[PDB]
């Protein structure tokens, strides 16, 4: 169960795991929905859907093998699951239908059907869903005029102005050989190490990825969509996280576990926890938490999110969460750090060791492109056992003391005071 | 040199209040003496200070 890298034209990384028996070859691209300017937003989505429709229709009738994909910010994650002993067919299909040719798939009728399906899907996502809506709005507001804030799906206005030529140009400017790993997560050992190097298994347009000019930034802003028709509320605070490949990633993740998740409709969640959960339960202040610390190569975000049925006590929820964040950098009980360490160990163990090979393939590709070499979870355990209260205190004092916050919540938000009793209260306590 | 050192100097609210009070004290003293000096030398021969010296013989 050891990961092996190399560099022979295309980086090939394998993580044998004899436990599961669903071999899943894959392809991962390091430039997704961030390295592209806002005027052509949904090109990655169009690629994703043309794949997932026509190639999914073809594969099963040809052989037996599913297929999936993903995109977060810079991840043309692109996976072809299979049986343990049919990976050569998977690579043959992947060669013959994804990198070449790109003309038989991009037919007019097929492209237009994909276009209308994507339009319908983005439309009803904008209508029905809500937490993901406010999350995308949070990203957009935190990175204004930065190639990081445009959504993964896109905007209908941007979608409507795409036919072929721009999709072809993106294909020729980001499907290179410089940044295209070939993941082999599953129960394959070395066939992936050799078959990936053949006569022509090499991406078209060898060259480099065109680097964007501006890097990133941060500045606080609101994109609220205040509308009283919807029943509940939604908020999403944020403070600038830690970028991947920094010696603060894991301590930030720990700071994103002391408070932890919550769900006020469970007998096993309303009762445990920390001081804020004791202080909230007296009334029905809130209805959900979600603490997270997202990180990307450009920069990272330390998240927060609720969905509160109560609409009049929003300010009290906000004030209590802010006081907890304020005092996280003044005094933390050592037992709190210990419990956070144990819980976070559990969370990473669950995430990295899911029985589904696709998620492991995704994460292996992510790390191998960004870090350059996978960091085994064992080293994660050893390097997290040494996180002491001094380190968390220092990191919190650096990242959470009078800092810009981005908030963008839909629903009924009129009870939320606008910006000064939501920011200048974030250090008011006499430290 | 407005680096993180001043932000760390302003991080603690209590030292902020201590510094503002000490500044108030020193400001009160120096401002008062400066204002008195300017008001005084602005009037040569007017104020009693030099009048009593002149009448002294």
């Amino acid at each position: 169960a050891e990961v092996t890298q190399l560099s022979n034209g295309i980086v090939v990384a394998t993580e044998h795991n004899p436990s599961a028996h669903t071999a899943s070859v894959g392809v991962v691209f390091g430039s997704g929905a961030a390295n592209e300017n806002p005027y052509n937003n949904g090109v990655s989505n169009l690629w994703k859907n043309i794949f997932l429709s026509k190639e999914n229709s073809a594969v099963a009738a040809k052989e037996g093998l599913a297929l999936s994909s993903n995109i977060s910010r810079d991840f043309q994650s692109y996976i072809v699951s299979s049986l343990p002993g049919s990976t050569d067919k998977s690579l043959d299909f992947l060669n013959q239908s994804f990198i070449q040719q790109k003309a038989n798939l991009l037919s007019s009728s097929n492209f237009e059907a994909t276009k209308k399906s994507v339009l319908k899907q983005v439309q009803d996502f904008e209508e029905n869903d809500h937490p993901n809506r406010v999350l995308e709005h949070l990203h957009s507001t935190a990175f204004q005029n930065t190639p990081l804030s445009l959504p993964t799906r896109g905007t209908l206005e941007s979608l409507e102005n795409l036919v072929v030529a721009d999709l072809e140009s993106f294909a020729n400017n980001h499907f290179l050989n410089s940044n295209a790993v070939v993941v082999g997560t599953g129960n394959i050992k070395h066939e992936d190490l050799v078959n990936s190097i053949e006569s022509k298994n090499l991406s078209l347009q060898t060259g480099t990825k065109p680097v964007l000019k501006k890097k990133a930034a941060f500045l606080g802003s609101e994109v609220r969509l205040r509308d009283d028709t919807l029943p509940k509320a939604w908020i999403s605070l944020a403070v600038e996280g830690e970028p991947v490949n920094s010696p603060n990633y894991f301590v930030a993740k720990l700071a994103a576990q002391i408070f932890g998740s919550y769900n006020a409709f469970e007998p096993a969640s309303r009762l445990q926890g920390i001081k804020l959960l004791d202080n909230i339960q007296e009334y029905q202040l809130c209805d959900n938490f979600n603490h997270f610390s997202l990180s990307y190569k450009d920069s990272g975000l330390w998240g927060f999110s609720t969905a509160t049925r109560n609409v009049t006590m929003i300010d009290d929820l906000i004030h209590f969460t802010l006081k907890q964040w304020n005092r996280l950098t003044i005094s933390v009980t050592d037992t709190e750090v210990e419990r956070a360490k144990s819980l976070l160990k559990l969370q990473l163990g669950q995430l990295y060791e899911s029985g589904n090979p696709v998620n492991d393939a995704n994460l292996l590709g992510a790390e191998v492109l960004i870090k350059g070499s996978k960091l085994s979870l064992g080293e994660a355990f050893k390097k997290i056992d040494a996180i002491t209260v001094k380190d968390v205190k220092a990191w919190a004092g650096k990242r959470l003391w009078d800092q810009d916050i981005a908030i963008a919540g839909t629903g009924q938000i009129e009870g939320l005071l606008d910006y000064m009793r939501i920011r200048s209260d974030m250090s008011m306590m006499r430290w | 040199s407005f680096s993180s050192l001043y932000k760390t100097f302003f991080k603690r609210n209590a030292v902020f209040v201590g510094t503002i009070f000490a500044g108030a004290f020193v400001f009160q003293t120096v401002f008062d003496t400066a204002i008195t000096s300017w008001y005084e030398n602005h009037n040569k021969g007017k104020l009693w200070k030099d009048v009593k010296a002149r009448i002294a013989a």
Binding site: P38, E136, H137, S140, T141, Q144, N145, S149, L150, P151, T155, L156, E157, S158, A217, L219, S221, V223, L225, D402 | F2, S3, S4, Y6, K7, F10
Partner: peptide
């Protein structure tokens, strides 16, 4: 103009610096 398309704030943004010095 979609919802995500923020208006041009560069007429007032402090694009230069944008560090802790402003807070100070």
């Amino acid at each position: 103009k979609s919802t995500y398309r923020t208006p041009n704030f560069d007429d007032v943004l402090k694009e230069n610096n944008d560090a802790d010095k402003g807070r100070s």
